Each structure stands twice: as structure tokens, then as C-alpha cells.
Design a protein around this nucleic acid. Sequence first.
RNA 1: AUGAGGUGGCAAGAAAUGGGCUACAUUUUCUACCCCAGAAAAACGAUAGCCCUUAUGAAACUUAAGGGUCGAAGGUGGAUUUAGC
Length: 349
Amino acid sequence: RTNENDPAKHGDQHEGQHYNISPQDLETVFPHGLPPRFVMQVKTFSEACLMVRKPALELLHYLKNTSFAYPAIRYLLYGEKGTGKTLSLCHVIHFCAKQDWLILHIPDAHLWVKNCRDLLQSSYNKQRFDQPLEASTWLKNFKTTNERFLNQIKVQEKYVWNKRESTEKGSPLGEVVEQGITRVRNATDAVGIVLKELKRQSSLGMFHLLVAVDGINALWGRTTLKREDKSPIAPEELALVHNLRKMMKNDWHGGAIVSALSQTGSLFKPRKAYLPQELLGKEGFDALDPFIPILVSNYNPKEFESCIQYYLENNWLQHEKAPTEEGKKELLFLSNANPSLLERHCAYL
RNA sequence: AUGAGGUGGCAAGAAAUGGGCUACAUUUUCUACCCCAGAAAAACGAUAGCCCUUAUGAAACUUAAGGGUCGAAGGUGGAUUUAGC
Ligand SMILES: Nc1ncnc2c1ncn2[C@@H]1O[C@H](COP(=O)(O)OP(=O)(O)OP(=O)(O)O)[C@@H](O)[C@H]1O
Ligand SMILES: Nc1nc2c(ncn2[C@@H]2O[C@H](COP(=O)(O)OP(=O)(O)O)[C@@H](O)[C@H]2O)c(=O)[nH]1
Ligand SMILES: [Mg+2]
């Protein structure tokens, strides 16, 4: 536990201690993305406490040393399953949001590339496919996270939604987002327009952009979605995926592209694929490189004690032997300091 | 000719019954995977029927296999009753 709640002052001195996110900030900045199990824990406890760690502090120092004049640099948080990459990305997202950044956050790319009942054909490009439901979902999440910047940011082009309906240069980005949401048919197109406008305006310096993409390995992998002829679909055929790759490019400046690999839900990948190349594949490695790889691993004994004491204080560990050092040692044995295994045991312990 | 040889052919269903397989689903449907996920959920449910193609073969309505098609009965079951330490 730390008294410091501002995400710009805390550093290594706070290592091994929880950092609280207020409910209002959780709602605004993080209406999505956060792991389902941590969401259940937050619902149970009324406390969104993430222990600060070297990975998150490192990437915060990276973003403080970043020069927006530089073309946006890529960072890649990689590791095994349940090492907390998602929560580190969320922590840094909170930092940038409190720093007034525009957070272009992708909660998970695995969802975008599977189980898409609504798969129409993009009007803007008849050779691609749209995912109106997911487009609307992410548009709503982005609006929730950056409503303030939504109005402040204007468009710089004419965008035709129908033969008679269009949006005009200089209009606020709110008009585009509203069109995408209400007119779900235009959802993917609005997502692409938003990505383009945010990229160009970050280049112009209207704000500072953090492109925080979770499970980035999905983009350059494979897809299970099948055409009306049952043919397989490659990722580029998904306008969302192609636009997200365009964003993953570093050609633009005015921000940084942070990403976090995630095997959870990955397609055709064996359970043990956790290395950057093994996940991204040749195409993904080639697209991301250059990148700064940051490892996320199990807990150390200090952070293990911090997590256990957090659960004990919250009384989550309602069993009698949980405070006992023997129970602590058994938890360490079973979870090998793995955050996800530890929590998935503590849930019924 | 109650012996021998050659060509062609039914191998069906009022009705009952024995055994087996598949189900009626949510402990399920589906993918990935081979067990830390996302969808389906009145859809589940035919190895049956119809058409086409492929393998075998001299010969495929005859057999088997693959695709499409159709999505039927049924929603845990009567008399009763089988097997297992
Ligand atoms: N810094 C942290 N503060 C609090 N809890 C944490 C922290 N890091 C990890 N945990 C706990 O670890 C659990 C497991 O993390 P989780 O699996 O969601 O992360 P991940 O790195 O995205 O992994 P996965 O590959 O499983 O998606 C989280 O639910 C959370 O309870
Ligand atoms: N409906 C619509 N969509 C647009 C328009 N302009 C841009 N977009 C969307 O914004 C995305 C980015 O556009 P852009 O990169 O310039 O097109 P591309 O380079 O040819 O792929 C596209 O995928 C479109 O879906 C427009 O005028 N109308
Ligand atoms: Mg994570």
C-alpha cells in the first residue's frame, strides 16, 4: 500500500506496494480491458489496487523520457501467462490519462479475430470485412475514456457515410464517434477515420498519444472467421486489423505505441507459446521490429508477500490457515509466484 | 438327374420382437487447445431421405467414402427389465 495516488511521482521507492485507482478513474479510463478475474476481485473488494512493479515503472520512465519529436517508439511487454502484463499496461494507461494523454487502447486483439457473427463487407473497401459489433464496442469504450478530447479534436477531411450523408472538415471528432456508435453499420469506418485523424493530429502535436494494445500478437497471426463460402479470412481483410497495423507503424510522431503480448485466447498457438517471435510470427516480428522488449514474469518473494498481505487484509483468504506461514509457503509452491495461479487458488481459498 | 454346367432375379413390408448405434442437451453445442478462453443455447437432435462426386470392382440403385441438401421424430421414456464388487 502507498499513500501516493498520482501516477507520475511514484517510482522504484514504491516497489512492492499496492497503488489504488479511484472508482471514477476506473470507470472513465478503464471501462474495458481489465482482466475479467481482476474485475471480479474489484467488484468484491471495492478497491482496484495494483501493486507497482519494475515493468510498469520502467515503461513509465520510458514514456517520461520519450521525445514526441521522435517518431512514435514501440514497446512490447512480453512474457508467460498471467504475469500481469495487462495490469502494467493499465497502470501506464492511468499514468498517461492523468497526464492528459489520448489513450488509443485496444483491450484485446484476440476477440477481433474470432467469433464474429456480424461480418459484413466494408463499403469503403469492398475487398475487406467489417466487425460492426466490436467496432461499436471499442468506439464506446474510447468515448468513455476520452470524451474530453473528443470534442476538442476536430476532423480534417470530408467523410461520406451515405450517398447523401457525410461529415465535414473541421467538425469535432465527437460527430464521427457518434456516427460510428449510433450507425453501427458505419462503426468500423468511423474507427478507421478516428485512427487516421488521431495519428495525423498526434503528428501535428494537438495532444500526446499512447497506443496501448493488449495481446498484439493476434494482428499478425491467423483468423478463424469464415467467408460466406466458408473460405478462411486473413487478418488484413479486417479493416480494424489493417487500420490497427497502420497505427502500429511508427511513421507518425506525437506519442508512443505500447503493446503487451497475450497468449490468452490465441488461435492455433500451442499453450506454451510465450516468446515474442513465437507469438508474433514472422509478419508480426517484422511489423513491430524496431521495438523495446520488456519482460514480465512471476512475482518475487517481496511482491508475493505484498499480494498475500493484501488478500489477508481484504479477508479474501477466508480460510483459517491462509495467514499461517505454512499456508503462505504452500501458496508459493503451487503458484510459483504466478499472479494468475495465485489468484485462481486464493479465489476459493 | 435328387448329378454336372451357363445366363437372369427377389433379398420387400401390414405387424411384432431381440440386440446394437445416435440422440433428447447446459456436466450441453462450437472452435482453439488438449483442460486458466469466445460464441451457441428451442437451438439440441439422422450414419435416415434426395442430388452430385470419389474408392473397389467387368458391373454401384446395389457397397463404402466425401460434399451439398434437407433439420424430421424425441425432450429421459409402459408393461417391465439387463450388467457390474
Ligand atoms: N500489479 C498487480 N497488482 C495486483 N494484482 C496483480 C498484479 N499483477 C498481477 N496481479 C494478479 O494476477 C492475476 C493474473 O493476471 P492476468 O492473468 O490477468 O494477467 P496477464 O499478464 O494479462 O495474463 P494472461 O496471459 O493470463 O492474460 C490478475 O488477476 C491480478 O489479480
Ligand atoms: N465511410 C468512410 N470511411 C472513410 C473515409 N475516409 C477514410 N475512411 C476510413 O478510414 C480508414 C483509413 O483510410 P485510408 O488509410 O486513407 O484508406 P486506405 O489507405 O486506402 O486504406 C479506411 O479504412 C476507411 O474505412 C470516408 O470518406 N468515408
Ligand atoms: Mg495482464
